[PDB]
From Swiss-Prot:
Protein name: Kappa-conotoxin PVIIA
Record-annotated site: Inserts into the pore of the channel and blocks the flow of potassium ions: 7
PTM sites of type 4-hydroxyproline: 4
Residues of the full protein shown: 46 to 72 of 72
Function: Kappa-conotoxins bind and inhibit voltage-gated potassium channels (Kv). This toxin inhibits the drosophila Shaker channel (IC(50)=57-80 nM). In vivo, when tested in fish, this toxin induces hyperactivity, followed by continuous contraction and extension of major fins, without immobilization or death. Injection of this peptide together with the delta-conotoxin PVIA causes the sudden tetanus of prey (STOP) syndrome, which is a single, lethal 'fin-pop' in envenomed fish. When tested in mice, induces hyperactivity.
Subcellular localization, as worded in the UniProt entry: Secreted
Domain comment (free text): The presence of a 'disulfide through disulfide knot' structurally defines this protein as a knottin.
Organism for this UniProt entry: Conus purpurascens (Purple cone)
Length: 27
């Protein structure tokens, strides 16, 4: 699970929260 604020694409939100903000980073 990728940590918050980590550069992630909304198309492939690999975040732990699976949420990527407008800054193309995790949340």
């Amino acid at each position: 699970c990728r940590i918050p604020n980590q550069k992630c694409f909304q198309h492939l939100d690999d975040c732990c929260s699976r949420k990527c903000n407008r800054f193309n980073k995790c949340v």
